[PDB]
Amino acid sequence: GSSGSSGQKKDTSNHFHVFVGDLSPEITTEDIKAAFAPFGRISDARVVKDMATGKSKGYGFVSFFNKWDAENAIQQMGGQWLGGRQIRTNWATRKPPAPKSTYESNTKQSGPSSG
């Protein structure tokens, strides 16, 4: 914090982030914004990349000023074709599943027999 305050500063406090996947390797941070562009003014938009090489991971993030703007997209944008391939839109922030596993296999057989 330098001497003095720049002004109206905010860090996506009351913003809604959106999840985007199935994005072609040729898609750039811009491309994404262009998709949700007409779906509401986008603030935070970027394309996840590998911190090891720096290559397009595949999924990206898109935050909107309002909740509707995003939601609307998550539905419409979801299942659409961006750039040159489909895309998976959903809520970036979700709750983890509960610990529970089960499995069953009804064999109902003694053994194979032929001639």
PDB file of all heavy atoms in Angstrom, residues 20-60:
ATOM      1  N   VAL A  20     -15.397 -22.939 -16.984  1.00  0.00           N
ATOM      2  CA  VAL A  20     -15.456 -23.240 -18.409  1.00  0.00           C
ATOM      3  C   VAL A  20     -14.438 -24.310 -18.788  1.00  0.00           C
ATOM      4  O   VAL A  20     -13.266 -24.223 -18.426  1.00  0.00           O
ATOM      5  CB  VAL A  20     -15.201 -21.981 -19.259  1.00  0.00           C
ATOM      6  CG1 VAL A  20     -15.600 -22.224 -20.707  1.00  0.00           C
ATOM      7  CG2 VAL A  20     -15.949 -20.789 -18.682  1.00  0.00           C
ATOM      8  N   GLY A  21     -14.896 -25.321 -19.520  1.00  0.00           N
ATOM      9  CA  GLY A  21     -14.013 -26.395 -19.936  1.00  0.00           C
ATOM     10  C   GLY A  21     -14.232 -26.798 -21.381  1.00  0.00           C
ATOM     11  O   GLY A  21     -15.027 -26.183 -22.091  1.00  0.00           O
ATOM     12  N   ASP A  22     -13.523 -27.833 -21.818  1.00  0.00           N
ATOM     13  CA  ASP A  22     -13.643 -28.318 -23.188  1.00  0.00           C
ATOM     14  C   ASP A  22     -13.249 -27.233 -24.186  1.00  0.00           C
ATOM     15  O   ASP A  22     -13.709 -27.227 -25.328  1.00  0.00           O
ATOM     16  CB  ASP A  22     -15.072 -28.786 -23.463  1.00  0.00           C
ATOM     17  CG  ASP A  22     -15.284 -30.244 -23.106  1.00  0.00           C
ATOM     18  OD1 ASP A  22     -14.409 -31.069 -23.440  1.00  0.00           O
ATOM     19  OD2 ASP A  22     -16.325 -30.560 -22.493  1.00  0.00           O
ATOM     20  N   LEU A  23     -12.397 -26.314 -23.745  1.00  0.00           N
ATOM     21  CA  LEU A  23     -11.941 -25.221 -24.598  1.00  0.00           C
ATOM     22  C   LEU A  23     -10.760 -25.659 -25.459  1.00  0.00           C
ATOM     23  O   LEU A  23      -9.772 -26.188 -24.952  1.00  0.00           O
ATOM     24  CB  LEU A  23     -11.546 -24.014 -23.747  1.00  0.00           C
ATOM     25  CG  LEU A  23     -12.535 -23.612 -22.652  1.00  0.00           C
ATOM     26  CD1 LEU A  23     -11.852 -22.741 -21.608  1.00  0.00           C
ATOM     27  CD2 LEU A  23     -13.731 -22.889 -23.253  1.00  0.00           C
ATOM     28  N   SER A  24     -10.871 -25.431 -26.764  1.00  0.00           N
ATOM     29  CA  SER A  24      -9.813 -25.804 -27.697  1.00  0.00           C
ATOM     30  C   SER A  24      -8.474 -25.218 -27.260  1.00  0.00           C
ATOM     31  O   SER A  24      -8.407 -24.197 -26.576  1.00  0.00           O
ATOM     32  CB  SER A  24     -10.156 -25.324 -29.108  1.00  0.00           C
ATOM     33  OG  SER A  24      -8.983 -25.018 -29.843  1.00  0.00           O
ATOM     34  N   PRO A  25      -7.379 -25.880 -27.665  1.00  0.00           N
ATOM     35  CA  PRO A  25      -6.020 -25.445 -27.328  1.00  0.00           C
ATOM     36  C   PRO A  25      -5.629 -24.159 -28.049  1.00  0.00           C
ATOM     37  O   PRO A  25      -4.599 -23.557 -27.748  1.00  0.00           O
ATOM     38  CB  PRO A  25      -5.147 -26.609 -27.800  1.00  0.00           C
ATOM     39  CG  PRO A  25      -5.942 -27.267 -28.875  1.00  0.00           C
ATOM     40  CD  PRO A  25      -7.384 -27.105 -28.482  1.00  0.00           C
ATOM     41  N   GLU A  26      -6.458 -23.744 -29.002  1.00  0.00           N
ATOM     42  CA  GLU A  26      -6.196 -22.530 -29.765  1.00  0.00           C
ATOM     43  C   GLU A  26      -6.973 -21.348 -29.192  1.00  0.00           C
ATOM     44  O   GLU A  26      -6.817 -20.213 -29.641  1.00  0.00           O
ATOM     45  CB  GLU A  26      -6.569 -22.734 -31.235  1.00  0.00           C
ATOM     46  CG  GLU A  26      -8.039 -22.484 -31.531  1.00  0.00           C
ATOM     47  CD  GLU A  26      -8.544 -23.298 -32.707  1.00  0.00           C
ATOM     48  OE1 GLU A  26      -8.121 -23.017 -33.848  1.00  0.00           O
ATOM     49  OE2 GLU A  26      -9.362 -24.214 -32.484  1.00  0.00           O
ATOM     50  N   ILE A  27      -7.811 -21.626 -28.199  1.00  0.00           N
ATOM     51  CA  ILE A  27      -8.613 -20.587 -27.563  1.00  0.00           C
ATOM     52  C   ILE A  27      -7.773 -19.759 -26.596  1.00  0.00           C
ATOM     53  O   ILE A  27      -6.940 -20.294 -25.864  1.00  0.00           O
ATOM     54  CB  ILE A  27      -9.810 -21.186 -26.802  1.00  0.00           C
ATOM     55  CG1 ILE A  27     -10.770 -21.871 -27.776  1.00  0.00           C
ATOM     56  CG2 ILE A  27     -10.531 -20.103 -26.013  1.00  0.00           C
ATOM     57  CD1 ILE A  27     -11.344 -20.937 -28.818  1.00  0.00           C
ATOM     58  N   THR A  28      -7.997 -18.449 -26.599  1.00  0.00           N
ATOM     59  CA  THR A  28      -7.262 -17.546 -25.722  1.00  0.00           C
ATOM     60  C   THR A  28      -8.196 -16.858 -24.733  1.00  0.00           C
ATOM     61  O   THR A  28      -9.413 -16.848 -24.916  1.00  0.00           O
ATOM     62  CB  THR A  28      -6.505 -16.472 -26.527  1.00  0.00           C
ATOM     63  OG1 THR A  28      -5.759 -15.630 -25.642  1.00  0.00           O
ATOM     64  CG2 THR A  28      -7.471 -15.628 -27.345  1.00  0.00           C
ATOM     65  N   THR A  29      -7.618 -16.283 -23.683  1.00  0.00           N
ATOM     66  CA  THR A  29      -8.399 -15.593 -22.663  1.00  0.00           C
ATOM     67  C   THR A  29      -9.474 -14.716 -23.296  1.00  0.00           C
ATOM     68  O   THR A  29     -10.591 -14.623 -22.786  1.00  0.00           O
ATOM     69  CB  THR A  29      -7.504 -14.720 -21.765  1.00  0.00           C
ATOM     70  OG1 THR A  29      -6.763 -15.548 -20.861  1.00  0.00           O
ATOM     71  CG2 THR A  29      -8.338 -13.721 -20.976  1.00  0.00           C
ATOM     72  N   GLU A  30      -9.130 -14.073 -24.408  1.00  0.00           N
ATOM     73  CA  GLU A  30     -10.067 -13.204 -25.108  1.00  0.00           C
ATOM     74  C   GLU A  30     -11.266 -13.996 -25.620  1.00  0.00           C
ATOM     75  O   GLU A  30     -12.413 -13.683 -25.299  1.00  0.00           O
ATOM     76  CB  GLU A  30      -9.370 -12.501 -26.274  1.00  0.00           C
ATOM     77  CG  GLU A  30      -8.153 -11.692 -25.858  1.00  0.00           C
ATOM     78  CD  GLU A  30      -7.713 -10.709 -26.926  1.00  0.00           C
ATOM     79  OE1 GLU A  30      -6.887 -11.091 -27.781  1.00  0.00           O
ATOM     80  OE2 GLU A  30      -8.197  -9.557 -26.907  1.00  0.00           O
ATOM     81  N   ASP A  31     -10.993 -15.022 -26.418  1.00  0.00           N
ATOM     82  CA  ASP A  31     -12.049 -15.860 -26.975  1.00  0.00           C
ATOM     83  C   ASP A  31     -13.166 -16.074 -25.958  1.00  0.00           C
ATOM     84  O   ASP A  31     -14.338 -15.834 -26.250  1.00  0.00           O
ATOM     85  CB  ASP A  31     -11.479 -17.208 -27.417  1.00  0.00           C
ATOM     86  CG  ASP A  31     -11.008 -17.194 -28.859  1.00  0.00           C
ATOM     87  OD1 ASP A  31     -11.837 -16.917 -29.750  1.00  0.00           O
ATOM     88  OD2 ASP A  31      -9.811 -17.461 -29.094  1.00  0.00           O
ATOM     89  N   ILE A  32     -12.794 -16.528 -24.766  1.00  0.00           N
ATOM     90  CA  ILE A  32     -13.764 -16.775 -23.707  1.00  0.00           C
ATOM     91  C   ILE A  32     -14.647 -15.553 -23.475  1.00  0.00           C
ATOM     92  O   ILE A  32     -15.870 -15.625 -23.595  1.00  0.00           O
ATOM     93  CB  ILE A  32     -13.071 -17.151 -22.384  1.00  0.00           C
ATOM     94  CG1 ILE A  32     -12.130 -18.339 -22.597  1.00  0.00           C
ATOM     95  CG2 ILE A  32     -14.106 -17.473 -21.317  1.00  0.00           C
ATOM     96  CD1 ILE A  32     -11.750 -19.046 -21.315  1.00  0.00           C
ATOM     97  N   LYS A  33     -14.020 -14.431 -23.143  1.00  0.00           N
ATOM     98  CA  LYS A  33     -14.746 -13.191 -22.897  1.00  0.00           C
ATOM     99  C   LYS A  33     -15.727 -12.902 -24.029  1.00  0.00           C
ATOM    100  O   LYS A  33     -16.843 -12.439 -23.793  1.00  0.00           O
ATOM    101  CB  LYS A  33     -13.768 -12.024 -22.746  1.00  0.00           C
ATOM    102  CG  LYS A  33     -13.337 -11.773 -21.311  1.00  0.00           C
ATOM    103  CD  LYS A  33     -12.162 -10.811 -21.241  1.00  0.00           C
ATOM    104  CE  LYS A  33     -10.834 -11.550 -21.288  1.00  0.00           C
ATOM    105  NZ  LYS A  33      -9.682 -10.613 -21.391  1.00  0.00           N
ATOM    106  N   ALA A  34     -15.305 -13.179 -25.257  1.00  0.00           N
ATOM    107  CA  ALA A  34     -16.148 -12.953 -26.425  1.00  0.00           C
ATOM    108  C   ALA A  34     -17.425 -13.784 -26.351  1.00  0.00           C
ATOM    109  O   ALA A  34     -18.487 -13.347 -26.791  1.00  0.00           O
ATOM    110  CB  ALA A  34     -15.382 -13.271 -27.700  1.00  0.00           C
ATOM    111  N   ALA A  35     -17.311 -14.984 -25.791  1.00  0.00           N
ATOM    112  CA  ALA A  35     -18.457 -15.876 -25.658  1.00  0.00           C
ATOM    113  C   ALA A  35     -19.462 -15.332 -24.650  1.00  0.00           C
ATOM    114  O   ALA A  35     -20.638 -15.152 -24.966  1.00  0.00           O
ATOM    115  CB  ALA A  35     -17.997 -17.268 -25.248  1.00  0.00           C
ATOM    116  N   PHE A  36     -18.993 -15.070 -23.435  1.00  0.00           N
ATOM    117  CA  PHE A  36     -19.852 -14.547 -22.378  1.00  0.00           C
ATOM    118  C   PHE A  36     -19.958 -13.027 -22.467  1.00  0.00           C
ATOM    119  O   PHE A  36     -20.616 -12.392 -21.644  1.00  0.00           O
ATOM    120  CB  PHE A  36     -19.314 -14.953 -21.005  1.00  0.00           C
ATOM    121  CG  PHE A  36     -19.110 -16.434 -20.855  1.00  0.00           C
ATOM    122  CD1 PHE A  36     -18.005 -17.056 -21.413  1.00  0.00           C
ATOM    123  CD2 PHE A  36     -20.026 -17.205 -20.156  1.00  0.00           C
ATOM    124  CE1 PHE A  36     -17.815 -18.418 -21.276  1.00  0.00           C
ATOM    125  CE2 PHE A  36     -19.841 -18.567 -20.015  1.00  0.00           C
ATOM    126  CZ  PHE A  36     -18.735 -19.174 -20.577  1.00  0.00           C
ATOM    127  N   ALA A  37     -19.306 -12.452 -23.471  1.00  0.00           N
ATOM    128  CA  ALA A  37     -19.328 -11.009 -23.669  1.00  0.00           C
ATOM    129  C   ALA A  37     -20.758 -10.481 -23.707  1.00  0.00           C
ATOM    130  O   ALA A  37     -21.160  -9.648 -22.895  1.00  0.00           O
ATOM    131  CB  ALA A  37     -18.592 -10.639 -24.950  1.00  0.00           C
ATOM    132  N   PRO A  38     -21.546 -10.975 -24.674  1.00  0.00           N
ATOM    133  CA  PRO A  38     -22.943 -10.567 -24.842  1.00  0.00           C
ATOM    134  C   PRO A  38     -23.836 -11.079 -23.716  1.00  0.00           C
ATOM    135  O   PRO A  38     -25.038 -10.813 -23.692  1.00  0.00           O
ATOM    136  CB  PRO A  38     -23.343 -11.206 -26.174  1.00  0.00           C
ATOM    137  CG  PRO A  38     -22.430 -12.374 -26.322  1.00  0.00           C
ATOM    138  CD  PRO A  38     -21.133 -11.971 -25.677  1.00  0.00           C
ATOM    139  N   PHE A  39     -23.241 -11.817 -22.784  1.00  0.00           N
ATOM    140  CA  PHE A  39     -23.982 -12.368 -21.656  1.00  0.00           C
ATOM    141  C   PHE A  39     -23.780 -11.518 -20.405  1.00  0.00           C
ATOM    142  O   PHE A  39     -24.175 -11.907 -19.306  1.00  0.00           O
ATOM    143  CB  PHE A  39     -23.544 -13.809 -21.384  1.00  0.00           C
ATOM    144  CG  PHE A  39     -24.021 -14.786 -22.421  1.00  0.00           C
ATOM    145  CD1 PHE A  39     -23.311 -14.972 -23.595  1.00  0.00           C
ATOM    146  CD2 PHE A  39     -25.180 -15.519 -22.219  1.00  0.00           C
ATOM    147  CE1 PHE A  39     -23.749 -15.871 -24.550  1.00  0.00           C
ATOM    148  CE2 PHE A  39     -25.622 -16.419 -23.170  1.00  0.00           C
ATOM    149  CZ  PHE A  39     -24.904 -16.596 -24.336  1.00  0.00           C
ATOM    150  N   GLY A  40     -23.159 -10.356 -20.581  1.00  0.00           N
ATOM    151  CA  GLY A  40     -22.914  -9.469 -19.459  1.00  0.00           C
ATOM    152  C   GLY A  40     -21.459  -9.057 -19.353  1.00  0.00           C
ATOM    153  O   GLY A  40     -20.560  -9.853 -19.628  1.00  0.00           O
ATOM    154  N   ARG A  41     -21.225  -7.812 -18.953  1.00  0.00           N
ATOM    155  CA  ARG A  41     -19.869  -7.295 -18.814  1.00  0.00           C
ATOM    156  C   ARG A  41     -19.020  -8.222 -17.949  1.00  0.00           C
ATOM    157  O   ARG A  41     -19.357  -8.490 -16.796  1.00  0.00           O
ATOM    158  CB  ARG A  41     -19.894  -5.892 -18.205  1.00  0.00           C
ATOM    159  CG  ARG A  41     -20.176  -4.794 -19.217  1.00  0.00           C
ATOM    160  CD  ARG A  41     -20.867  -3.604 -18.570  1.00  0.00           C
ATOM    161  NE  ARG A  41     -20.947  -2.459 -19.473  1.00  0.00           N
ATOM    162  CZ  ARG A  41     -21.819  -2.371 -20.471  1.00  0.00           C
ATOM    163  NH1 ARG A  41     -22.680  -3.354 -20.694  1.00  0.00           N
ATOM    164  NH2 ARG A  41     -21.830  -1.297 -21.251  1.00  0.00           N
ATOM    165  N   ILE A  42     -17.920  -8.708 -18.514  1.00  0.00           N
ATOM    166  CA  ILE A  42     -17.024  -9.605 -17.793  1.00  0.00           C
ATOM    167  C   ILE A  42     -15.878  -8.833 -17.149  1.00  0.00           C
ATOM    168  O   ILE A  42     -15.290  -7.944 -17.765  1.00  0.00           O
ATOM    169  CB  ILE A  42     -16.442 -10.686 -18.723  1.00  0.00           C
ATOM    170  CG1 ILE A  42     -17.543 -11.273 -19.610  1.00  0.00           C
ATOM    171  CG2 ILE A  42     -15.771 -11.780 -17.908  1.00  0.00           C
ATOM    172  CD1 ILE A  42     -17.014 -12.056 -20.791  1.00  0.00           C
ATOM    173  N   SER A  43     -15.563  -9.182 -15.906  1.00  0.00           N
ATOM    174  CA  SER A  43     -14.487  -8.521 -15.175  1.00  0.00           C
ATOM    175  C   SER A  43     -13.239  -9.399 -15.134  1.00  0.00           C
ATOM    176  O   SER A  43     -12.199  -9.045 -15.690  1.00  0.00           O
ATOM    177  CB  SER A  43     -14.938  -8.188 -13.752  1.00  0.00           C
ATOM    178  OG  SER A  43     -15.764  -9.212 -13.225  1.00  0.00           O
ATOM    179  N   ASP A  44     -13.353 -10.546 -14.472  1.00  0.00           N
ATOM    180  CA  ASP A  44     -12.235 -11.476 -14.358  1.00  0.00           C
ATOM    181  C   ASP A  44     -12.381 -12.623 -15.352  1.00  0.00           C
ATOM    182  O   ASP A  44     -13.245 -13.486 -15.197  1.00  0.00           O
ATOM    183  CB  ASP A  44     -12.146 -12.026 -12.934  1.00  0.00           C
ATOM    184  CG  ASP A  44     -12.086 -10.927 -11.891  1.00  0.00           C
ATOM    185  OD1 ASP A  44     -12.903  -9.985 -11.973  1.00  0.00           O
ATOM    186  OD2 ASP A  44     -11.223 -11.009 -10.993  1.00  0.00           O
ATOM    187  N   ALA A  45     -11.530 -12.627 -16.373  1.00  0.00           N
ATOM    188  CA  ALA A  45     -11.562 -13.669 -17.391  1.00  0.00           C
ATOM    189  C   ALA A  45     -10.152 -14.102 -17.778  1.00  0.00           C
ATOM    190  O   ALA A  45      -9.323 -13.278 -18.163  1.00  0.00           O
ATOM    191  CB  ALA A  45     -12.323 -13.184 -18.618  1.00  0.00           C
ATOM    192  N   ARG A  46      -9.889 -15.401 -17.674  1.00  0.00           N
ATOM    193  CA  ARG A  46      -8.578 -15.944 -18.012  1.00  0.00           C
ATOM    194  C   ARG A  46      -8.674 -17.429 -18.348  1.00  0.00           C
ATOM    195  O   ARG A  46      -9.680 -18.078 -18.057  1.00  0.00           O
ATOM    196  CB  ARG A  46      -7.602 -15.733 -16.854  1.00  0.00           C
ATOM    197  CG  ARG A  46      -7.847 -16.660 -15.675  1.00  0.00           C
ATOM    198  CD  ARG A  46      -6.756 -16.526 -14.623  1.00  0.00           C
ATOM    199  NE  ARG A  46      -5.435 -16.836 -15.164  1.00  0.00           N
ATOM    200  CZ  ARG A  46      -4.670 -15.948 -15.789  1.00  0.00           C
ATOM    201  NH1 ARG A  46      -5.093 -14.702 -15.951  1.00  0.00           N
ATOM    202  NH2 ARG A  46      -3.480 -16.306 -16.252  1.00  0.00           N
ATOM    203  N   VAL A  47      -7.623 -17.962 -18.961  1.00  0.00           N
ATOM    204  CA  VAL A  47      -7.588 -19.370 -19.335  1.00  0.00           C
ATOM    205  C   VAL A  47      -6.540 -20.128 -18.528  1.00  0.00           C
ATOM    206  O   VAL A  47      -5.340 -19.900 -18.679  1.00  0.00           O
ATOM    207  CB  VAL A  47      -7.289 -19.545 -20.836  1.00  0.00           C
ATOM    208  CG1 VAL A  47      -7.138 -21.018 -21.183  1.00  0.00           C
ATOM    209  CG2 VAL A  47      -8.383 -18.902 -21.675  1.00  0.00           C
ATOM    210  N   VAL A  48      -7.002 -21.032 -17.670  1.00  0.00           N
ATOM    211  CA  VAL A  48      -6.104 -21.825 -16.839  1.00  0.00           C
ATOM    212  C   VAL A  48      -4.945 -22.382 -17.658  1.00  0.00           C
ATOM    213  O   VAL A  48      -5.131 -22.845 -18.782  1.00  0.00           O
ATOM    214  CB  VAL A  48      -6.850 -22.993 -16.164  1.00  0.00           C
ATOM    215  CG1 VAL A  48      -5.882 -23.856 -15.369  1.00  0.00           C
ATOM    216  CG2 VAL A  48      -7.966 -22.469 -15.274  1.00  0.00           C
ATOM    217  N   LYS A  49      -3.747 -22.332 -17.085  1.00  0.00           N
ATOM    218  CA  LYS A  49      -2.555 -22.833 -17.760  1.00  0.00           C
ATOM    219  C   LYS A  49      -1.670 -23.613 -16.794  1.00  0.00           C
ATOM    220  O   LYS A  49      -1.791 -23.474 -15.577  1.00  0.00           O
ATOM    221  CB  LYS A  49      -1.764 -21.673 -18.370  1.00  0.00           C
ATOM    222  CG  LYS A  49      -2.357 -21.148 -19.666  1.00  0.00           C
ATOM    223  CD  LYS A  49      -1.718 -19.833 -20.080  1.00  0.00           C
ATOM    224  CE  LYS A  49      -2.233 -19.363 -21.432  1.00  0.00           C
ATOM    225  NZ  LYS A  49      -1.828 -17.960 -21.722  1.00  0.00           N
ATOM    226  N   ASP A  50      -0.779 -24.430 -17.344  1.00  0.00           N
ATOM    227  CA  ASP A  50       0.129 -25.230 -16.530  1.00  0.00           C
ATOM    228  C   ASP A  50       1.243 -24.365 -15.948  1.00  0.00           C
ATOM    229  O   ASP A  50       1.943 -23.664 -16.677  1.00  0.00           O
ATOM    230  CB  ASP A  50       0.729 -26.364 -17.363  1.00  0.00           C
ATOM    231  CG  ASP A  50       1.849 -27.086 -16.637  1.00  0.00           C
ATOM    232  OD1 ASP A  50       1.743 -27.255 -15.405  1.00  0.00           O
ATOM    233  OD2 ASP A  50       2.830 -27.478 -17.302  1.00  0.00           O
ATOM    234  N   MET A  51       1.399 -24.420 -14.629  1.00  0.00           N
ATOM    235  CA  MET A  51       2.428 -23.641 -13.950  1.00  0.00           C
ATOM    236  C   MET A  51       3.805 -24.265 -14.152  1.00  0.00           C
ATOM    237  O   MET A  51       4.812 -23.735 -13.683  1.00  0.00           O
ATOM    238  CB  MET A  51       2.117 -23.540 -12.455  1.00  0.00           C
ATOM    239  CG  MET A  51       2.133 -24.880 -11.738  1.00  0.00           C
ATOM    240  SD  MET A  51       1.386 -24.801 -10.100  1.00  0.00           S
ATOM    241  CE  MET A  51      -0.343 -25.041 -10.504  1.00  0.00           C
ATOM    242  N   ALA A  52       3.841 -25.392 -14.855  1.00  0.00           N
ATOM    243  CA  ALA A  52       5.095 -26.086 -15.121  1.00  0.00           C
ATOM    244  C   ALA A  52       5.647 -25.715 -16.494  1.00  0.00           C
ATOM    245  O   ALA A  52       6.855 -25.543 -16.664  1.00  0.00           O
ATOM    246  CB  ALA A  52       4.897 -27.591 -15.020  1.00  0.00           C
ATOM    247  N   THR A  53       4.755 -25.594 -17.472  1.00  0.00           N
ATOM    248  CA  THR A  53       5.153 -25.245 -18.831  1.00  0.00           C
ATOM    249  C   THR A  53       4.502 -23.942 -19.277  1.00  0.00           C
ATOM    250  O   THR A  53       5.093 -23.165 -20.026  1.00  0.00           O
ATOM    251  CB  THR A  53       4.783 -26.359 -19.827  1.00  0.00           C
ATOM    252  OG1 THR A  53       3.361 -26.420 -19.989  1.00  0.00           O
ATOM    253  CG2 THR A  53       5.301 -27.707 -19.350  1.00  0.00           C
ATOM    254  N   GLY A  54       3.278 -23.707 -18.812  1.00  0.00           N
ATOM    255  CA  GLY A  54       2.566 -22.495 -19.173  1.00  0.00           C
ATOM    256  C   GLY A  54       1.666 -22.689 -20.378  1.00  0.00           C
ATOM    257  O   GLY A  54       1.346 -21.733 -21.085  1.00  0.00           O
ATOM    258  N   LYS A  55       1.258 -23.931 -20.616  1.00  0.00           N
ATOM    259  CA  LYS A  55       0.390 -24.250 -21.744  1.00  0.00           C
ATOM    260  C   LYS A  55      -1.076 -24.234 -21.323  1.00  0.00           C
ATOM    261  O   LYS A  55      -1.403 -24.505 -20.167  1.00  0.00           O
ATOM    262  CB  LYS A  55       0.752 -25.620 -22.321  1.00  0.00           C
ATOM    263  CG  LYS A  55       2.197 -25.724 -22.779  1.00  0.00           C
ATOM    264  CD  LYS A  55       2.410 -25.029 -24.114  1.00  0.00           C
ATOM    265  CE  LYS A  55       3.800 -25.304 -24.669  1.00  0.00           C
ATOM    266  NZ  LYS A  55       4.278 -24.195 -25.541  1.00  0.00           N
ATOM    267  N   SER A  56      -1.955 -23.918 -22.268  1.00  0.00           N
ATOM    268  CA  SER A  56      -3.386 -23.865 -21.995  1.00  0.00           C
ATOM    269  C   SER A  56      -3.863 -25.162 -21.347  1.00  0.00           C
ATOM    270  O   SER A  56      -3.855 -26.223 -21.973  1.00  0.00           O
ATOM    271  CB  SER A  56      -4.165 -23.611 -23.287  1.00  0.00           C
ATOM    272  OG  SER A  56      -4.338 -22.223 -23.514  1.00  0.00           O
ATOM    273  N   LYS A  57      -4.278 -25.070 -20.089  1.00  0.00           N
ATOM    274  CA  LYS A  57      -4.761 -26.233 -19.354  1.00  0.00           C
ATOM    275  C   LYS A  57      -6.018 -26.804 -20.003  1.00  0.00           C
ATOM    276  O   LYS A  57      -6.198 -28.020 -20.069  1.00  0.00           O
ATOM    277  CB  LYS A  57      -5.050 -25.859 -17.898  1.00  0.00           C
ATOM    278  CG  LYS A  57      -3.849 -26.008 -16.982  1.00  0.00           C
ATOM    279  CD  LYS A  57      -3.781 -27.399 -16.374  1.00  0.00           C
ATOM    280  CE  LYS A  57      -2.574 -27.549 -15.460  1.00  0.00           C
ATOM    281  NZ  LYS A  57      -2.379 -28.961 -15.027  1.00  0.00           N
ATOM    282  N   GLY A  58      -6.885 -25.918 -20.484  1.00  0.00           N
ATOM    283  CA  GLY A  58      -8.114 -26.354 -21.122  1.00  0.00           C
ATOM    284  C   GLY A  58      -9.336 -25.649 -20.569  1.00  0.00           C
ATOM    285  O   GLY A  58     -10.246 -25.288 -21.316  1.00  0.00           O
ATOM    286  N   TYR A  59      -9.359 -25.454 -19.255  1.00  0.00           N
ATOM    287  CA  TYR A  59     -10.482 -24.792 -18.600  1.00  0.00           C
ATOM    288  C   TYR A  59     -10.158 -23.329 -18.309  1.00  0.00           C
ATOM    289  O   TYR A  59      -8.994 -22.953 -18.181  1.00  0.00           O
ATOM    290  CB  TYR A  59     -10.840 -25.514 -17.301  1.00  0.00           C
ATOM    291  CG  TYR A  59      -9.636 -25.922 -16.482  1.00  0.00           C
ATOM    292  CD1 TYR A  59      -9.266 -25.206 -15.351  1.00  0.00           C
ATOM    293  CD2 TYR A  59      -8.868 -27.023 -16.841  1.00  0.00           C
ATOM    294  CE1 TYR A  59      -8.166 -25.574 -14.600  1.00  0.00           C
ATOM    295  CE2 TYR A  59      -7.767 -27.399 -16.097  1.00  0.00           C
ATOM    296  CZ  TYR A  59      -7.421 -26.672 -14.977  1.00  0.00           C
ATOM    297  OH  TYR A  59      -6.324 -27.042 -14.232  1.00  0.00           O
ATOM    298  N   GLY A  60     -11.199 -22.509 -18.206  1.00  0.00           N
ATOM    299  CA  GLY A  60     -11.005 -21.097 -17.930  1.00  0.00           C
ATOM    300  C   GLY A  60     -11.989 -20.567 -16.906  1.00  0.00           C
ATOM    301  O   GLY A  60     -12.961 -21.239 -16.560  1.00  0.00           O
TER     302      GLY A  60
END
